[PDB]
Structures are given as C-alpha cells and as structure tokens.
C-alpha cells in the first residue's frame, strides 16, 4: 500500500537529527512505474551523511578493484600505505585464465607500502625505483597501472611525470590513475576516473595500426567483470550466434584486447554505470555505436540476443534463433524444477550500480517478486531505467543507511534478501534467507543460460533451506 | 626515572648554546643524557661533539629504501661527558613538513633501542618560532613531559614563549605535557630579569634561571665546545650548573595561562621595551 | 549447456569442451599471450636462487604483504567495549574495507562508521564531518560510547582529533559527558597491531588520566588482562576460563568475544558484552596488569607502568608449554591463588600428547608468518615439539623483536636452521620455500597461492599450507579455535601432526605403487 | 596581465615594512596592487590600512565554522593608494599548518573574484624562517612567480635567503617560479651592500636594491603608515620608489644556485664578520692552550 510505504519511510526518518533527516528523505521513495524522469521521485549520486553507516566504498575501489584490477596481464600498483591493497586483494571474483605471478597478476597485491618518511619526502622516487623492481621480477607483465590511494594527491606527488619518464625509458605502458579515495562520493567517480585513464593512456595506441583483420561481426563485451565466470557464459552465446568477441572489458581482459577494441563494429554494454563513459568516447572518436543489454534470466537474455542480432545481417538473426532454440529446453527444465519452489516469494535487493535493476527479470522468470531495491552509488539515469522495471508501490532506497535497511526489512518482511558481505550476517541472524549478489556467494556464473540454472539452484537452496525453521528454541 | 624534556624557543637567541651547556653540566654532575636535535638547522649537538655538522636522520633516511636500513651507530654519537647526540634534521627545503620529519626521527630512535634504561635525561632541542601543528607534534605525541622555554626580554622571543604556552594548553586537557618554566637568555636589556619574571608570573610559571651574557661563551664556541668543558672554572660555567640543578630539582610543572597581545604590550611598555602609542598622530603627515 | 539434475558451477562448467575451445580462441585471437614455453621458462626462473637474490634486494616494491593498516586494529580494539561504536574519522572507503575484512574472517556482522570526509575536506579539514558525524552516529545507532580513530587522509592533512571532538561537545553536537576516547592511527606507521595499541592506550587514558589521585594500586584485588589484536574467539575464552578456574579476580580490557559471536535466534544484536566503562575507570585499582601480546602493546605498557604504576610482568605471550607455565605461575604469584589440580592435570595431558606424537613431528621443517607475538609463540612451541622452524617471517616485526626471537632459537638445538625475517613479504617467502623447501607452511589464507605455485613446479615440490593466523577466509569457523594456553597447544599439536599424516596418506595412496606404506595404524 | 610576486625573508629584519613601503611606491606610481599577508608574526597590512591589526581569514573563519560564510569586504580591505589587503592568519598555535592557512586565503580570494586581472601586481608577504612545505605553498601552488628575498648582511638572514633559494629550485622545474633578486634591508653594517651583492652573484641573481636604515621609517611606522605616505618628500621615499621601479622593469628572473654552508661561512669570513676557527685548537680546554 503506497500509503503504508510512505508512512514507513517517515517513521524510519524520525530517529535522525534535522540535517540528516531532510537529506535522507530525498533518497527514499515509493516506486511509480509511470515515471521516466526519476529525479521527480528520488535523488542520487550525492555525498553520504557522516556517521550513518553508508555501505559505500571509495574511488580507489571503483578504479583499482573494479575497472583496472581485472586486466590480467598488467601489474596494478596500489600506490600509498599498505591498507587499501590488502583489504582488496582477491576479494572480488573477476575470473581469468593465466599463470599468476608469471604472465598474469590479478590475485596478487603489489604496493608501494608508504611509511612515514614517504609522506614527508613524497613517493615519486620510490615509485620510479618500484617500477624498475617490477620490471626486473615480473618481466612478462605487459603494462603497469598506478592506483593512487588517499595520500598521493594530498602530498603533491607527480605520478604523471614519473609514468611518462619511466614509460619512455622502458618503452612500457605505465598508467597513472588519480583514484584517491577522497575524490567523488563513492565507487562511481572511480569508474569515470578509470575510463578516462584508459582513454588517455591506452586506447589510442593502435590508432595508426592497420594490421588487425576485422570482420563485420566484431563486437566487444563492455562492462562485464566475469564474476564467477559471468563473461565466459555470456561470450559463448554471442559467438554461437556468429559474432566475434574481440574484447572483454575487463573480466579476463588483456591489455591487447583493450587496445584492439577501437576496431570493433559494435560495443555491447552490460554495466552501463561503470563503462558508459568509454563507450560514448568510442562512438565520438571511432564512430562505434553501443547498445545496452541484459543477460540475467532467459527472458532478458533472449530479448538481448534478438536485439543484438537485429543490428547485423540476416545470417546472424538466423543463428540467433538457432541458439535460442538450442537452450530453450534447458532453461525450461530449470524453470520447471525451481519455479514451483519459489513461486510468489518476495525479495529485497541492495547492490551497486547495475544489478539492483538488472536481475529483476531473472527473479520473475522463477515467479518471484522484487518488493524493494536500491543502489549504493547509482546516478539518476540508472533510476530512470529502474522505475519501469519495478512494480507499483515497491520501495526504492539510494545509499541506504544500515539503520534504514534494517528497519525496512523488519516492516516489509521479505522472504529473501540479495545484498553484500557487510549485510549478509545481519539478516541471517534475523532468520531471513540471504544471498550475496556481488560475489554470488562463491557460486555462479549467473549470466546467460548456463548461469540461469545456477542462479535458480542457489535461490532455492537458500530460501528453502531447513536451517530457517530452527532459530527459535522450542522452550520459547 | 628517565625524564623527557624539550627546550622550546625562538631562534637567534642562544637557545641551542644554553641547551648544550645545560646538558654538559648535567653530564658533569653524573647524569646520563641524550640530546635529540629537532631544529631544521641541525645545530643542537656541535658543542658536545666538537664537530661542524652531525649527519641527520632525515638526511640519511632520504638516501635509503626504508628508515630501518639506517644504523643507530651512524645516527647516535657519544660526545663530552658521554652524552649521546642525535640530529633529526628536516626534509628538503620547500617539500616536507619539518614537524613530521622530527617525529619520524624520534620514532626511529624508539624502535632502535636508543633509549637505554640507563638514561636519566633526554633533551629535545625544538624550534619555537612559528608554533605550528608540525613543530608542536613532540607535545601532541607525548614525546616530552617537561617543556622549558628559552626566551629573552624582547617582543618576538616573548611572543614565541606565549605561543609555545598556547600549544601546551591545547593538549593539556588530554595529556601530561606541562610547562616547567622560562629560561631567560640575557641580551643585556635593562630590566630584563624583572620583565621575564613578570611574564612567568602572568603565565603561571617561573623563570627557572637567568642566563647572563658572557663572552666566555664565544671563546668556548670558537673551539666547538661548551663552557662546562672549555673552562669549568669560568663564572658562566657555574651559571649553567645552577640551571641544571634547578631543573633536576624542579617540581613546578603547570598548565600555563597565555596572555593577550594587549597584556603582552602593556608588559613591554611597563619596562620601556616598548612605548605608549600616541593615537592622535596615527595616520598623519606634514 | 547444463543438465538440470546436475548443474555445474564455474568449476567444472568451464572444463566442458565448448567452453575450452572458446577460451583457446579468445587467447589465440586477441590476448597476444606470451608463448607457453616462454611462460614455463620464466616460471622456472622464479623458483631459483638467482631470482631469490634479486627478490631480496627489493627496496621500493612490496608484493603480497603480510600485514594490514592501523585503523583495522583500532576498530577491533573498540569493538571490545560495551555498547561502543568504532568510528573512523576520515574517508569512508576505508570503513567498507575494515568491515568486509572482519566479516569474512568471523562470518559475522561488524559495525563501524565513518564521517565521510571528501574532497572539500581535503583542503580545510574535517571538523564539520566530526560534528555531524558524532551527532548522527549517537542518534541513529545509540551507542553508549564512540571510540575514534583515523584514516590516512585525516592524518596527512593534520585534523586535530582532540580539538575536533572538544568543539563538537562545546557546540552541542553530542553531550559533554558522552565518552569519546580517541587515537591517531596513521596507516603509514607500523601496522594494524599498532592501531590496536594506539586505540587501547587512548581509551585507557580517557578514563583514567585525570583521576589518578583517586586510585590505589591493588585496592580492587583483580588482575587486568590486555589481549591485544586477537582474532580467535577461543583465545579470549581460554584466558577467562583459566583465571576463573584459579579463582583469580580479573578484568579483560577490550573483550569482543560476545559481539563477534552472537546467536542466530531471530534478532540482530549490534552490540553485545564487552569491557564496561566502569571496568576501565577502575582498572588502575588492580593489583597489576598483564599484557598478553607485549610486542604490540608498547605504548599501552608505558602508560600502564608510568601512570597506573603497575609493575607489568615481563611475560611472553602464553603459547606453548613453558610460556603457559610462566603465565600461570606469575598470575599465581600476583593474586596469591595457587595453581589448581585441574590446570596441573591439563598441563600433563598436553605433555602426554607431545610424547604420543613426537615421532611424527620430529625434525619436520616449517615456514611460518603472522604478527610478532603469535609468530614467536608458534616458534617456541615448535621447538618444544622437536620441530624445525626454518623460515620465520614477520612483515611487521622489528629489530628488537628479531633479537628476542633469535635468542629463543639459540636456546634450542632445534632452532639451528632457522632464520628470522622482518620487513619481508609473502613474495619473499615464496622464494624461500622454493630454494630451501620446508615440509609445510603455517600461515593465513594468502598462503594458498604459494602452495599452488609450488605444486606447479611439481607434486614433489608442493608445500602444503596449514591454516593458523589471520585472516582465514577459505575455511569455515576456524575463528572459533584456540592458540593460547594448554588448550591452544593441544589444538595446534593435533593440527600439525594430522596435517603431516594427511599428506603422508596422500603420498602413499598409489595402488601397487606407494600403498605398501598406506598404514591403517600410525 | 598580472604579476604575482612574493616577498620572502626571515623574521625580525624589517621585511614587512619594506614590502608595504614597496607596494605603496607602486601605488603612488599608478599600479593596482593587492597584499596577501602570510606571516604569523608580522602583520603585512598594518601600514597600508593605518590599522593596529587586520582581521584574518582564519580568525574570521572561526566565527562561522567555515570560510564559505565570510564576505570579501570583511577580509579584503583597501588602504593607501587603493592597494587591497588581506591577512591569511597564522596557524593556530599548536595545531595549524601555515601551508593550509595560505591555501585558505587563495581560494576565498579566487572565488570572490578578488583575484582578477584588474590587478597589476599581487604580493604575498611570507615568512622565510623555516622553508617547509607549508610556507612554500605560494610557490607550490604556482601563485608566486617572482620571488624577491629580503635579507641582511648577517648569517641567519643570508642563511634564510639560501634556504628560500633552495625551495625555489625544487619547484623551478615544475612551474614558472623564479628568483627576481635580493633586497638588502641595511643594518648599517660596514660593507653590507658588497656582501649581499657577492651573495647575489653566487646565487646567480642580483641585489635589486639596498634599503638604507633611516629614522623616517620608524617615525612613519608609529603612525601606522609607510614613508611614501607619511613624508613623500623624504629621501627614504625615493629609495622605495627606485626599488619599486626596478621591480616593475625587472627582467632578471632565474633559477638560483644555492651555496653550501662552507661557502656561506667562507664568504662571511672573507668579510671579517665571522671569526676564523683555529682547527689545531678545536676541542682543547682553556687549560691545555
Ligand atoms: S578511502 Fe587505505 S585502508 Fe584507509 S587508512 Fe589509508 S591505507 Fe588504511 Fe579508499 S583510497 Fe584507501 S580504501 Fe581508504 S585508504 Fe583512501
Ligand atoms: S605544520 Fe608547520 S612544519 Fe609542517 S608543513 Fe605546516 S607550517 Fe610547515
Ligand atoms: Ca556467523
Ligand atoms: Na630471465
């Protein structure tokens, strides 16, 4: 009941001091599927109020942990003190194939480990020496990135100069990234800062090179970090459809694939939030058009395959229908087995910048209803694409606070919650089935047809697990 | 046992000379002392070492991969009366925070075991011109509990003394750092001793000692030494011994009451150092 | 493709032929990958002594560190006080990381807030963030205490915690009597354990600095116990159990055992148990104060000895037989309580276990890492077991600590092949286990990558990992274990000998090849 | 366009009276100038405003929790010849950084549009006692492009001049900062001018002007004004006019060559200001020799 939700919101806000109350009220809203300009209902991408326990991360997380970290054959230096690189070492499951420590380096933590003397004198000389050491001990790395942590900009270091000098000296691509954590208000600005760094130091390397033989079916997967193998289970379908995937940005990605992307015919954007920046740039500079797609669940996947195929000739469209017919009996069997076990169950989600709206279709393919959703750092163009996907009178929350999330959950009483690691254990203690929707709870892939089977199996094992019937001691 | 003291004061008024003669006097009477220079000029130990310039920790640290690459042995040097000497040094001109450079050096001495269980005293010779958060770090980080301010009967030196007292007041409500007194380095101004005693009284402290001007100090320094070592019979030598004894027996450690600019000027006028201002001409010509 | 009744997750899904062909094409067509023979050549070179020398002369690059930053430790320390909310003044990204890091190790909620200083605070400081932050935090989460620490951004720009909090109170953002102890915790100084020490001394000074004239040493008849950075629930527990067993009055200062282990009974408890504010205020009135991990409690020790006037005993961490004996004897001496028959019997049971397993443990070689106190305690027990601690690595260790460990080693023939390394990381350790191969590695989850690396050289070069330390993210509930006291020694001994027997069973499981030694009894 | 200059020098040698007398000379000359006081212990606008002490940004910014509340006219005051004055406000004793206190001022001025091209000259008056990251912020943030060092014919003043020169050199290869010259504030010492000239030659610069000691300077000061205003016919007035003219036409902007302490001591010894040390006697007691 729209009234009941509006009332819930106001009740929850009562605990806040005046300033925080007025601000938070603008980030909470009752959905109206008719709205197309989300700003009329909710504001986003603003700073978080102090002391409220936001679930958000920083720009470094958005640049190092999200965009750059996954590029497998490059060495990424967490530049600054030891903290940042250690907490983010192998925490995100951006899968890849490689010989780690030899030609690939994703799971390792390279850092300049700033000590007090580095703060006093600056770390540019340390950076230069570090680079020579990286070159000596990891000769097969194909490029280096410098991910700035908070102190870099604060002490006035000039990492751009160091990168230029060492880059020319070693004939190596060295990318300075100003993703210090104090910039922006969340992981989002980190994405933008990272996209601009790729554009300015990597993307135009082959602008004058014509040795790449292109075909009219060349595409690039933009914005899929291959969580649990998500990109590979996406790539397989596109190629079965007759297309040729030249690059993957950036799950299991190589620096060469990135440098080859300007030669593709179409950029396929999955994560709009993190890579719409570089996508717009490629259209502007190379004339490459880009389109958004969704590989979550059979309905969205079939719709996406068909929309993508329509961009090419009839032969691709024919293969598209052959691929859809091949998998039809597989996902129908998944639905046949699991939908009756999940039919009608209600889910509340809270994620980053894409999935909060992107997974709705998959839940509906299993007869489930998303009664609440929100993003940690989405912008309003994200909410514009969200309201039409959510049901009337469902709850929306931007940069939700720990307190808010807990209170909304106690009132709404979802049958399942899909959020992050910092949220997981809170709700399990409340007896509410919980599934991690960032790390897929160490399961996955969830993208495509093969991913749908796993997703269904996972929602079922958790929601209907026998443990949820045992939280109350029988002598109570 | 071990008492941690810091000598704070404006530059250019003999503070380093007074600090080294105070220390030499304590070593002379049997105390174990360590001198840690915390002035970017790094001239707090030459008289004890009979040297032209002691290698600083900051200088050597900049050349190394990590500060732990340094060895106490190149940093700590034994001089007159066995007193141990160290110079923090500062970062290159224009780049670092001199204050953070000083904390880096002290943290190094701590880890390296430089503070022997033997030590009776440790004296930090710190710059007190501009009392910024940087130079106030030894206070904020409880590196020293007893602060002794060296000043003179002039405006700026006294102004510096009031600022240092302010620094102390800043951290007093959360730490044990306190003002043990003023040390007046005489510039031979007329009623100088009276003026500093008056300031001490207003600050709520004491003028622990009046160090008179004596040219024996310069004859000692041209030989790179303290008076205590150069001429122990000198009357000035006894001046430093009295200062030493009084610090050793000091029990007056307070949280000062900085005065206002007005209060300071009224004081400077009460002793002729400054004159009343005819505000009738303020803004005239011919 | 998927078979609905046997769904495959990433492993082994991607092993299917169609996925395998697809990955081969991705590589050949767009990765411009180095030839496999070149990759083998470099990999081999990375296992050599020549590479190890180059590796050890690094001066600027750090690879796979075995330490974290200060505030992580400040948050854990704060978490051990009643209804206390850890608050880190600075950038919020840090807080998302500290929580996540502890959430994965304890598999429990971890509450902590930030005051989200952003770019516009980088120039003029975060005084406003502190005012609004403390007010919003107290109002929203209702803690009875807010313990403040800092991120590197706040440290670099010089925000004065003391002044910022005083002003927040002076201006009415939080009650003047509301406890807000604080500590500067720069990530570029020491490590996470240093942050624990800083935060603890900060809380201790907040509740006792100004009221020392009211204290009388020994008046409350208790013994204070300061645990230090501790991530094993059984460690807080075994200490309280042994003291209660002895009838010794005590006070555990920073006790997070309840809040790191709440029951799943239908409600989320943000706060639970913990050291009370009254216990901190009363602490100076104890007979003495015992520090369980002295190598990372140096600042606390100076304050406890210098201000509380407690004659802090010179005791090593209570790990292993000798050190647990020493701890009990000292506690007995300070409290006047005798060591009871039950503890004497428990000791004898650990010794029995040592006599029963010594033949499999004798001469076994180990590489190990972790925090200073934990590492030296592990080293001491290994020596007691007749094992050889060959590669001892403590990234956040120091020169004085290394000398102490070198002395412990010199006191035993079993310490002859050991070398203690400080300032070195897990990439340095990786070279050591390739050039001077030990039988096992005792360390945290990051060690799994080293095991994987050694297996690649060959099954006969594989060095299996035995998980003891922090963090442990790839196994469940090991955070419930114990490493201190006789109980912890029994657990570690059991884990070590069974790790040896498991590997031996693996190597003798070859039908008609190595199974002649696949003994039913060992 | 606009010439952003900065006057650097140790404290206590009259640097601020020279800065203000210089600026007043540029004003009676017809130049639009703004003085940005960056000294904690030497108010740089007192003589231009006849005031006893000008309210500082930091000081008035406390009076509102933040600077985003201050008003250009509360901070920027105009005085003699129309030169505009603003005092950054030294670092709060014990907790502030002089470097952030400057950055504060620059931003407030830039955003209130008080840093536009209607100005012919901007002069940051900064203390050179310690040349740390904080006090070199006007150079680091590339706001001070022409540095003039006020010094004297004595050790500390000359040592500071060399210190500032070292700071200039550290940023010279990153931006346009340069040393315009040395300004010698006389102490009435014998051969002082020649000594500072020798120092300028070694540093690679020039001694742009020798400012004589003259009592009209003090008579003017107690009346809280410059000599240019107090007695424009005084001989000292023309001294400031000449220094002002030379700065306006100055074309010698260089990257200085700081000297070693040994060179500095040899110079002072060459002039007889520093006693020559008898090495054979170093470390010997009075009784031994
Ligand atoms: S927002 Fe890093 S965890 Fe922090 S206190 Fe500094 S070392 Fe430690 Fe983002 S970039 Fe990183 S994660 Fe924070 S620190 Fe800034
Ligand atoms: S705090 Fe002081 S010493 Fe440090 S940079 Fe600022 S002005 Fe310089
Ligand atoms: Ca749990
Ligand atoms: Na090679």
Question: What would you say this structure looks like, in words?
Answer:
- This is part of a larger assembly, with one copy of chain A (about 475 residues), two copies of chain B and one copy of chain C (about 525 residues).
- Chain A has about 475 residues and is of the alpha/beta class.
- In chain A, about 45% of the residues lie in helices and about 15% in strands.
- Chain A folds into three domains: about 1-60 and about 340-475, Nitrogenase molybdenum iron protein domain (Rossmann fold, 3-Layer(aba) Sandwich); about 60-200, Nitrogenase molybdenum iron protein domain (Rossmann fold), CATH 3.40.50.1980; about 200-315, Rossmann fold (3-Layer(aba) Sandwich).
- In chain A, helix 13 packs antiparallel against helix 14.
- The longest helix of chain A is centred in the C-terminal third of the chain and has 29 residues, at about 315-340.
- Chain B has a single domain (about 1-285), classed as Rossmann fold, CATH 3.40.50.300.
- Helices cover about 40% and strands about 15% of the residues of chain B.
- Chain B is globular and about 65 Å long.
- The N and C termini of chain B lie far apart (about 65 Å).
- By secondary structure, chain C is an alpha/beta fold.
- Chain C has four domains: about 70-215, 3-Layer(aba) Sandwich (Rossmann fold), CATH 3.40.50; about 215-320, Rossmann fold (3-Layer(aba) Sandwich), CATH 3.40.50.1980; about 320-365 and about 485-520, Nitrogenase Molybdenum-iron Protein, subunit B, domain 4 (Up-down Bundle); about 365-470, Nitrogenase molybdenum iron protein domain (Rossmann fold).
- Helix content of chain C is about 45%, strand content about 10%.
- Chain C is built from 21 helices and twelve strands.
- Chain C has helices spanning about 10-15, 15-30, 35-45, 50-55, 70-80, 90-105, 120, 125-140, 150-155, 160-170, 190-210, 235-245, 275-280, 300-305, 320-335, 340-360, 370-385, 400-410, 425-435, 450-455, 485-505, and strands at about 60-65, 85-90, 115, 145-150, 225, 250, 290, 365-370, 390-395, 420, 440-445, 465.
- Chain C has a five-stranded parallel β-sheet with strand order 10-9-8-11-12, with helices on both faces. In chain C, strands 3-2-4 form a three-stranded parallel β-sheet, sandwiched between helices. Chain C has a three-stranded parallel β-sheet with strand order 6-5-7.
- In chain C, helix 20 (about 450-455) links the parallel strand 11 (about 440-445) and strand 12.
- The relative contact order of chain C is 0.10.
- Chains in contact: A-B, A-C, B-C, B-D, C-D.
- Chains B and D meet through helix 7 of B and helix 7 of D.
- Strand 3 of chain A pairs antiparallel with strand 1 of chain C, so a sheet runs across the interface.
- The complex binds FE(8)-S(7) cluster, iron/sulfur cluster, calcium ion and sodium ion.
- Iron/sulfur cluster sits at the interface of chains B and D.
- Calcium ion binds near residues 107 and 108 of chain C.
């Amino acid at each position: 009941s729209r009234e009941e939700v509006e009332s819930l919101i106001q009740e929850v806000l009562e605990v806040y001091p005046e300033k925080a109350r007025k601000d938070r009220n603008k980030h909470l809203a009752v959905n109206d599927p008719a709205v197309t300009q989300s700003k009329k209902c909710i504001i986003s991408n603003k700073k978080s109020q102090p002391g409220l326990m936001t679930i958000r991360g920083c720009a470094y997380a958005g640049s190092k942990g999200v965009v750059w970290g996954p590029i497998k054959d490059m060495i990424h230096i967490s530049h600054g003190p030891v903290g940042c690189g250690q907490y983010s070492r192998a925490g995100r499951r951006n899968y890849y194939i490689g010989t780690t420590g030899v030609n690939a380096f994703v799971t390792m933590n390279f850092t300049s480990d700033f000590q007090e003397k580095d703060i006093v004198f600056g770390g540019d000389k340390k950076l230069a020496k570090l680079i020579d050491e990286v070159e000596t001990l990891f000769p097969l790395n194909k490029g280096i990135s410098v991910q700035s942590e908070c102190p870099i900009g604060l002490i006035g270091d000039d990492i751009e100069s160091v990168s230029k000098v060492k880059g020319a000296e070693l004939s190596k691509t060295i990318v300075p990234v100003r993703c210090e954590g104090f910039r922006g208000v969340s992981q989002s600005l980190g994405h933008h800062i990272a996209n601009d760094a790729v554009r300015d130091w990597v993307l135009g390397k082959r602008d004058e090179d014509t040795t790449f033989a292109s075909t009219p079916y060349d595409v690039a997967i933009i914005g899929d970090y291959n969580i649990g193998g998500d990109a590979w289970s996406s790539r397989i379908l596109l190629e079965e459809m007759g297309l040729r995937c030249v690059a993957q940005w950036s799950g299991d990605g190589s620096i060469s694939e990135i440098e080859l992307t300007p030669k593709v015919k179409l950029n396929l954007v999955h994560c709009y939030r993190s890579m719409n920046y570089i996508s717009r740039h490629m259209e502007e500079k190379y004339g490459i058009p880009w389109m958004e797609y969704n590989f979550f669940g059979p309905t969205k996947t079939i719709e996406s395959l068909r929309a993508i195929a329509a961009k090419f000739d009839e032969s691709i469209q024919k293969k598209c229908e052959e691929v859809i017919a091949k998998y039809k009996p597989e996902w129908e069997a998944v639905v046949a087995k699991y939908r009756p076990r999940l039919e009608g169950k209600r889910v509340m989600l809270y994620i980053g910048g894409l999935r909060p709206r992107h997974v709705i279709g998959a839940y509906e393919d299993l007869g489930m209803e998303v009664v609440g959703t929100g993003y940690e750092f989405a912008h309003n163009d994200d909410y514009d694409r969200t309201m039409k996907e959510m049901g009337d009178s469902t709850l929306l929350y931007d940069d939700v606070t720990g307190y808010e999330f807990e209170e909304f959950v106690k009132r709404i009483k979802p049958d399942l919650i899909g959020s992050g690691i910092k949220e997981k254990f809170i709700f399990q203690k409340m007896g509410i089935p919980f599934r991690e929707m960032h790390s897929w709870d160490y399961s996955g892939p969830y993208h495509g047809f093969d991913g749908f089977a796993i997703f269904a199996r996972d929602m079922d094992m958790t929601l209907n697990n026998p443990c949820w019937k045992k939280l109350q001691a029988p002598w109570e | 046992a071990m008492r941690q003291c810091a000598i704070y004061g404006k530059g250019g008024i003999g503070k380093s000379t007074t600090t080294q003669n105070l220390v030499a006097a304590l070593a002379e009477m049997g105390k174990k002392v360590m001198i840690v220079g915390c002035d970017p000029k790094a001239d707090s130990t030459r008289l004890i070492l009979h040297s032209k310039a002691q290698n600083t920790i900051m200088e050597m640290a900049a050349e190394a991969g990590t500060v732990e690459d340094l060895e106490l042995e190149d940093v700590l040097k034994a001089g007159y009366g066995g007193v141990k000497c160290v110079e923090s040094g500062g970062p290159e001109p224009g780049v670092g925070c001199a204050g953070r450079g000083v904390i880096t050096a002290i943290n190094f001495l701590e880890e390296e075991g430089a503070y022997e269980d033997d030590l009776d005293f440790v004296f930090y010779d710190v710059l007190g011109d501009v009392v910024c958060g940087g130079f106030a770090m030894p206070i904020r980080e409880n590196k020293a509990q007893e602060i002794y301010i060296v000043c003179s009967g002039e405006m700026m030196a006294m102004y510096a003394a009031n600022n240092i007292s302010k620094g102390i007041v800043k951290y007093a409500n959360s730490g044990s750092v306190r003002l043990g007194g003023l040390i007046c380095n005489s510039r031979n101004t007329d009623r100088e001793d009276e003026l500093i005693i008056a300031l001490a009284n207003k600050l709520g402290t004491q003028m622990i000692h009046f160090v008179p001007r004596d040219n024996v100090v310069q004859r000692a320094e041209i030989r790179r030494m303290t008076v205590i070592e150069y001429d122990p019979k000198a009357k000035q030598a006894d001046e430093y011994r009295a200062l030493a004894r009084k610090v050793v027996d000091n029990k007056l450690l307070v949280i000062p009451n900085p005065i206002t600019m007005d209060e300071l000027e009224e004081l400077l006028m009460e002793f002729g150092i400054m004159e009343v201002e005819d505000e009738s001409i303020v803004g005239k010509t011919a | 493709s998927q078979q609905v009744d046997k769904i495959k997750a990433s492993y082994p899904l991607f092993l299917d032929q169609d996925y395998k062909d697809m990955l081969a094409k991705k590589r050949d067509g767009f990765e411009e990958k180095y030839p496999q023979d070149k990759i083998d050549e470099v990999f081999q070179w990375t296992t050599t002594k020549e590479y190890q020398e180059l590796n050890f002369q690094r001066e600027a690059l750090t690879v796979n560190p075995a330490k974290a930053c200060q505030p992580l430790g400040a948050v854990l320390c704060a978490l051990g006080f009643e209804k206390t909310m850890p608050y880190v003044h600075g950038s919020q990204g840090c807080v998302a990381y500290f929580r996540s890091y502890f959430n994965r190790h304890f598999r429990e909620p971890v509450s902590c807030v930030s005051d989200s200083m952003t770019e516009d605070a980088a120039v003029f400081g975060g005084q406003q963030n502190m005012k609004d932050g403390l007010q919003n935090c107290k109002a929203t989460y209702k803690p009875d205490m807010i313990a403040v620490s800092t991120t590197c951004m706040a440290e670099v720009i010089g925000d004065d915690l003391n002044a910022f909090i005083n002003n927040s109170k002076k201006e009415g953002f939080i009650p003047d009597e509301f406890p807000v102890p604080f500590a500067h915790t720069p990530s570029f100084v020491g490590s996470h354990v240093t942050g624990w020490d800083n935060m603890f001394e900060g809380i201790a000074r907040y509740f006792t600095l100004k009221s020392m004239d009211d204290k009388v040493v020994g008046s409350n008849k208790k013994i204070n116990i300061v645990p230090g950075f501790e991530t094993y629930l059984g460690n807080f527990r075994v200490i309280k159990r042994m003291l209660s067993e002895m009838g010794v009055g005590y006070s555990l200062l920073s006790d997070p055992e309840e809040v790191l282990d709440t029951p799943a009974d239908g409600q989320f408890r943000m706060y639970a148990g913990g050291t009370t504010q009254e216990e901190m205020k009363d602490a100076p009135n104890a007979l003495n104060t015992v520090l369980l991990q002295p190598w990372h409690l140096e600042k606390t020790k100076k304050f406890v000895e210098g201000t509380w006037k407690h004659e802090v005993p010179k005791l090593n961490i209570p790990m292993g037989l000798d050190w647990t004996d020493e701890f009990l004897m000292k506690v007995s001496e300070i409290s006047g309580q005798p060591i009871p028959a039950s503890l004497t019997k428990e000791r004898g049971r650990l010794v029995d276990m040592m006599t029963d397993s010594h033949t499999w443990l004798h001469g076994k070689r180990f590489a190990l890492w972790g925090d200073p106190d934990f590492v030296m305690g592990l080293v001491k027990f290994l020596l007691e077991l007749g094992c050889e601690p060959v590669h001892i690595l403590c990234h956040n260790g120091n020169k004085r600590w290394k000398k102490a460990v070198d002395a412990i080693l010199a006191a035993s023939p079993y310490g002859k092949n050991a070398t203690v390394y400080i300032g070195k990381d897990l990439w340095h350790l990786r070279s050591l286990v390739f050039t001077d191969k030990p039988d096992f590695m005792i360390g945290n989850s990051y060690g799994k990558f080293i095991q994987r690396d050694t297996l690649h050289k060959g099954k006969e070069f594989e060095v299996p990992l035995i998980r003891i330390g922090f963090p442990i993210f790839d196994r469940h509930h090991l955070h419930r274990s114990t490493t201190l006291g006789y109980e912890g020694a029994m657990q570690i001994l059991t884990t070590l000998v069974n790790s040896i027997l498991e590997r031996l069973d693996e190597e003798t499981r070859g039908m008609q090849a190595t199974d002649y030694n696949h003994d039913l009894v060992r």
